[PDB]
């Protein structure tokens, strides 16, 4: 009741401060100058604004027993901001998972800021009926002196249009990305074993036919994995045509170092992408799980409208909205625990020390 807004002041400060640090890490540290971190910044701005504009007023309403204390046309604006920032979070998370998947089937700041503005303009688009209709008709934004989204059509259609189509895409594109990266690793182990098999074949060889056939199959396996090494095989395949067998065999042991080079490089690469898919999936998992109680309970407010205790349902909505607000505090901590780049960045900003 009266004591309950002491907890909420904590959740505001950790939100504001963590997300400021995320915006500072992406603005300053050059190891974060990529499209994914550009989305993560935009998300942190949404998280910061939710902490500044929405969350203190929600705390304020807890102090006035949910009876709305500000001007009456401020109610529909507060619900607009609340839905706007949460809608922008889900559409960001979806835009990350989609963009990161599309990139794995492919070979600029401007390209990222264009996508972000698209996410924000859709979020402003979908949230827009709330003040347009709500400022016109208080029956849509007030229930018994309390400022809450009252129109059940807005809750249902918004819950599915503005949160189930992005979630569907986010969950599908995440799972296909795991499978995409799993095939890439499978396909590189296969290319390692056939290169290594033909390395052992060239070294055992007695004649020009065995080397020429084995280097032809090394070049084929080279075309699958890729540039640099392919010509070096051709540098040795022309030796094997002339009959220069000892001469081709010594070139192939020189190919060995160039093969081991591209293997560890493409091998780190997929480990790092699967490290990153692991972090983003915790961000994704937490957003849904923490907002899941509020989402289900608010839809059940609408279904059993008369059948259920409106007072109990509403006393759970007021608890379950802070589990989702707490999700504004988590994304920064996730980055601290699972990225050296953010953890180092944050650790120096805490000592008021900004130069990379």
Ligand X SMILES: CCCCCCCC/C=C\CCCCCCCC(=O)OC[C@H](O)CO
Ligand Y SMILES: CC(C)CCC[C@@H](C)[C@H]1CC[C@H]2[C@@H]3CC=C4C[C@@H](O)CC[C@]4(C)[C@H]3CC[C@]12C
Tell me the closest approach of the beta carbon of residue 68 to ligand X, in angstroms.
Answer: 10
Q: Which of 38, 39, 163, 262 binds ligand 9SC (CB under 6 A)?
A: 163
Q: Which is nearer to Mg ion, 8 or 191 (CB)?
A: 191
Give the C-alpha separation, 154 to 348, whole Å. 45
Give the C-alpha separation, 47 to 200, whole Å. 57
User: Which of ligand Y, ligand 9SC, ligand X, none does residue 107 bind (CB under 5 to 8 Å by kind)?
Assistant: none
Q: Which of 316, 323, 333, 334 binds ligand Y (CB under 6 A)?
A: 316
Q: Check: CB of residue 247 under 8 Å from CB of residue 307.
A: no
Region binding ligand 9SC by CB under 6 A among candidate stretches 34-42, 80-88, 115-123, 278-286: 80-88
98 token code pair = 């989609």
Give the C-alpha separation, 6 to 242, whole Å. 84
Give the C-alpha separation, 290 to 311, whole Å. 22
Tell me the closest approach of the beta carbon of residue 294 to ligand 9SC, in angstroms.
Answer: 6
Q: Which of 15, 324, 329, 339 binds ligand 9SC (CB under 6 A)?
A: 324
Coil, strand or helix: which one is 148? coil
Residue 143: strand pairing partners: 146
Q: Which residues bind Mg ion (CB under 5 A)?
A: 193, 197
How many residues interact with ligand Y (rule CB under 6 A)?
19
User: Which of Mg ion, ligand 9SC, ligand X, none does residue 321 bind (CB under 5 to 8 Å by kind)?
Assistant: ligand 9SC
Q: Check: CB of residue 158 under 8 Å from CB of residue 294.
A: no
Residue 333 CA: distances (Å) to CA of 19, 29, 33, 322? 10, 18, 20, 17
Give the C-alpha separation, 64 to 8, whole Å. 14
User: Which of ligand X, ligand Y, ligand 9SC, none does residue 291 bind (CB under 5 to 8 Å by kind)?
Assistant: ligand 9SC
User: Which of ligand X, ligand Y, Mg ion, none does residue 120 bind (CB under 5 to 8 Å by kind)?
Assistant: ligand X
Using CB under 6 A as the binding rule, whether residue 288 contacts ligand 9SC is answered as yes
Give the C-alpha separation, 275 to 268, whole Å. 10
Contacting residues toward ligand Y, per CB under 6 A: 16-17, 20, 23, 27, 45, 49, 293, 296-297, 300, 304, 308-309, 312-313, 316, 349, 352
């Amino acid at each position: 009741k009266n004591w309950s807004a002491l907890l909420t002041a904590v959740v505001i400060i950790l939100t504001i401060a963590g997300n400021i640090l995320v915006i500072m890490a992406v603005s300053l540290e050059k190891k974060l100058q990529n499209a994914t971190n550009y989305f993560l910044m935009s998300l942190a701005i949404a998280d910061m604004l939710l902490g500044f504009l929405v969350m203190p007023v929600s705390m304020l309403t807890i102090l006035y027993g949910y009876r709305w204390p500000l001007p009456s046309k401020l109610c529909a604006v507060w619900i607009y901001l609340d839905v706007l920032f949460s809608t922008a979070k889900i559409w960001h998370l979806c835009a990350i998972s989609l963009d990161r998947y599309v990139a794995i089937q492919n070979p600029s700041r401007t390209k990222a800021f264009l996508k972000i503005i698209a996410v924000w303009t859709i979020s402003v688009g979908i949230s827009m009926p709330i003040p347009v209709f709500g400022l016109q008709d208080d029956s849509k934004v007030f229930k018994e002196g309390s400022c809450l989204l009252a129109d059940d059509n807005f809750v249902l259609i918004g819950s599915f249009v503005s949160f189930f189509i992005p979630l569907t895409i986010m969950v599908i594109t995440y799972f296909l990305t795991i499978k995409s990266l799993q095939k890439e690793a499978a396909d590189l182990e296969d290319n390692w074993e056939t290169l290594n098999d033909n390395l052992k074949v060239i070294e055992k060889a007695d004649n020009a036919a065995q080397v020429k056939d084995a280097l032809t199959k090394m070049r084929a396996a080279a075309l699958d994995a890729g540039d640099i090494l392919v010509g070096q095989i051709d540098d040795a395949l022309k030796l094997a045509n002339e009959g220069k067998v000892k001469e081709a065999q010594a070139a192939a042991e020189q190919l060995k170092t160039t093969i081991n080079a591209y293997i560890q490089k493409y091998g780190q690469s997929i480990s790092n992408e699967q490290k990153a898919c692991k972090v983003l999936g915790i961000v994704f998992f937490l957003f849904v799980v923490m907002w899941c109680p509020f989402f289900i309970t608010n839809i059940m407010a609408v279904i059993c409208k008369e059948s259920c205790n409106e007072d109990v349902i509403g006393a759970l909505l007021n608890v379950f909205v802070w589990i989702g607000y707490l999700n504004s505090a988590v994304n920064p901590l996730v980055y601290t625990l699972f990225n050296k780049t953010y953890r180092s960045a944050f650790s120096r900003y805490i000592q008021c020390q900004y130069k990379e």
